[PDB]
């Protein structure tokens with residue numbers, strides 16, 4: 001569940017080794033910072049503002065990749081559900097969409113990210 | 120350009136006839152309301168809180184379908200870019216990811232919405 005995190009600072013890591021530390025409030029508001037480490041992508045290592053909402057078994061959150069130190073001219077939004085693991089707490093299983101305004105003006109890619117809890 | 124919407128509050132319609140009012144602050148933060156009017160979907164005709172972030176010509180925002188009136192046990196997140204139409208106006212081209220929990224566990228649908236500025 002995501003209500004079972006109300007006012008808790010939680011770090012998570014996905015299969016590409018990106019890390020996010022989200023702050024879920026009482027109401028379900030998510031705030032936090034995301035750190036990208038995915039090979040073949042920009043803005044790796046530095047922290048980016050993250051915001052969205054959690055409720056029950058589902059969550060959605062967003063990161064624009066400008067932090068006033070590296071601008072990738074892009075944005076990522078995740079929608080995902082809670083998958084409980086056999087003694088590994090819960091996971092956030094997601095699909096992302098990354099838009100970028102680069103060379104070919106605008107483009108949009110999609111992929112799967114699975115985020116594992118780290119106490 | 121999305122930076123040019125700082126301190127504005129603008130209205131947008133997608134092809135499904137869903138609506139969003141989006142408040143953009145000085146530092147690019149997006150807050151506002153989504154009203155789903157998409158056929159064959161739940162949580163229709165009701166206002167849901169949306170948050171996100173805009174910068175240059177990219178935007179990302181999400182909506183959990185739980186406002187404490189109607190809860191469809193789902194969450195959507197959008198990412199995309201500002202396009203200038205030949206028509207003369209401006210759209211937000213986006214990919215969305217709908218996460219929901221159903222008959223046998225968590226699921227994730229995906230699709231494309233194009234949002235049109237109402238003046």
Ligand SMILES: O=C(O)CCCC[C@@H]1SC[C@@H]2NC(=O)N[C@@H]21
Pocket residue numbers: 014016018036037038040041042043065072073074076096098100113
């Ligand atoms: O390279 C960019 O334009 C900004 C960073 C993009 C990294 C993407 S976002 C989706 C995927 N999951 C991650 O953890 N990182 C990559």
Ligand SMILES: O=C(O)CCCC[C@@H]1SC[C@@H]2NC(=O)N[C@@H]21
Pocket residue numbers: 133135137155156157159160161162184191192193195215217219232
């Ligand atoms: O049916 C649900 O579980 C909640 C409403 C989902 C509506 C989706 S969000 C993506 C797409 N774009 C819209 O404007 N409506 C649908």
